[PDB]
Amino acid sequence: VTNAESAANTTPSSHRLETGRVPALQAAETGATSNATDENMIETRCVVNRNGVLETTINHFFSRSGLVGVVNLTDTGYATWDIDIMGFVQLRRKCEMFTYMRFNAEFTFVTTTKNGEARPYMLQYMYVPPGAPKPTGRDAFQWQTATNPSVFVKLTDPPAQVSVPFMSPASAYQWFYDGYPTFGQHPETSNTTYGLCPNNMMGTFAVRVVSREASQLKLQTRVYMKLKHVRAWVPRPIRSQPYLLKNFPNYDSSKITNSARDRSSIKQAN
């Protein structure tokens, strides 16, 4: 384990005229990356590198906010949203670059109107953990939030923002789960439960307009999630195929998109 900033500098090198010392002939059949460097192949000069690599850690790469979900409220009176960040393909691909992730979160709530404005009304955001009863109306008893964490914010206020800890029963969030959640006779036709990790179901996010009568507005609240204190394990290739579903890595059998655009011939660089 080495810990350093900048970038590994080069050293001066001269020509080699001898037998038995061959740094260029590698062997990829051993599953190891080649270790030949600049100095041994060509004659090089000495440079002191200062090109900082602070911006390439997995803690500066993920600590950027990003839309995770949108919640349309018609005012049924209320609206719910099952917390799952794999719904928009911009923050889904960076998280699916890895297999296991352990991180804290920071959600930001941006609520607008139909045409886009901010009327001075009041909104209640309520988090419903797994097992807590979901509200059945806009004036139900679940909104009394004697134990559930809730946020009371207006439309004319700055966007709300809370901090969320690591709330998983396992030791890390896994995006890919190679198994079934239960025992029994699994079918051959419709496996509607394969690849469903129960350690990622975090609950339901509900929102209502705090009032007594019905307010005649169609709102739209966007949830912007940011990751922090993030640890990652077992990297895996980044997806190249377009996404089809939300909880499943389904792709299209026909019209498979190639991972490199076409050119005329193989002997024409351009």
Binding site: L17, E18, T19, P23, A24, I42, E43
Partner: protein
């Protein structure tokens, strides 16, 4: 620890997985000209990166009934790279070379090659005429072939009246198609003067004569090429003036 090798000179490298050795011509390394042996007063130039690297020539097909090829060594590189520009603008030239001749074949082909360097390899004119003014002489594209080489007419006498059988008194190697596929020679600067022009005088010359001609069975690969890569080790020039092609 003896057959694998890598030869990094400049921004070019040569990898091989089965060689025999690297013969060092007359047991000496290419050096810079000392202040004792030097005679020119002007300061010489030394690029040391752009001219000391592996230049690769075109490939020569090895037919079954082949005779051989030969190249002049300071003359194959006069239009290619920064070395040709340096050896066209300047007037004096001193450097050693670093040879490498590759000829790969399968384990079902047989044959051999004799690769060697011949200091002052003078081409003789063929023909029985013992009259000074009527005797035949070789053309300019036969004494100095260029980068496309030249074939032998009588490889048994090296086209100079000299037996090939006793041409093993020269720095040389073999390419036996059952043991190796590459022959390399590190030749120093051999001349009677410390500096010499690289356009009128060709110091030495490689010869590759195919003894024990190529043989194979039906169904094998017929096109067997031969590629050579030169490296001008320790090049220095002097006498900068207008550029002369030849």
């Amino acid at each position: 620890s003896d057959r694998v090798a890598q030869l990094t000179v400049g921004n070019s490298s040569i990898t091989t997985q089965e060689a025999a050795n690297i013969v060092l011509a007359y047991g000496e390394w290419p050096e810079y000209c000392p202040d004792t042996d030097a005679t020119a007063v002007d300061k010489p130039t030394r690029p040391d990166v752009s001219v000391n690297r592996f230049y690769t020539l075109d490939s020569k097909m090895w037919q079954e009934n082949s005779t051989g090829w030969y190249w002049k060594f300071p003359d194959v590189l006069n239009k290619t790279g920064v070395f040709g520009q340096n050896a066209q603008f300047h007037y004096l030239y001193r450097s050693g070379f670093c040879l490498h001749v590759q000829c790969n074949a399968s384990k079902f082909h047989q044959g051999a090659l004799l690769v060697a360097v011949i200091p002052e390899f003078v081409i003789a004119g063929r023909g029985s005429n013992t009259k000074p003014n009527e005797a035949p002489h070789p053309g300019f594209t036969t004494t100095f072939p260029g980068t496309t080489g030249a074939t032998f007419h009588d490889p048994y006498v090296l086209d100079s009246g000299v037996p090939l059988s006793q041409a093993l008194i020269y720095p040389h190697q073999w390419i036996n198609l059952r043991t190796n596929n590459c022959a390399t020679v590190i030749v120093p600067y051999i001349n009677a003067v410390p500096f010499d022009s690289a356009i009128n005088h060709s110091n030495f010359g490689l010869i590759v004569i195919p003894v024990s001609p190529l043989k194979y069975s039906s169904g094998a690969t017929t096109a067997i090429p031969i590629t050579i890569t030169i490296a001008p080790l320790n090049s220095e020039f002097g006498g900068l003036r207008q550029a002369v092609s030849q």
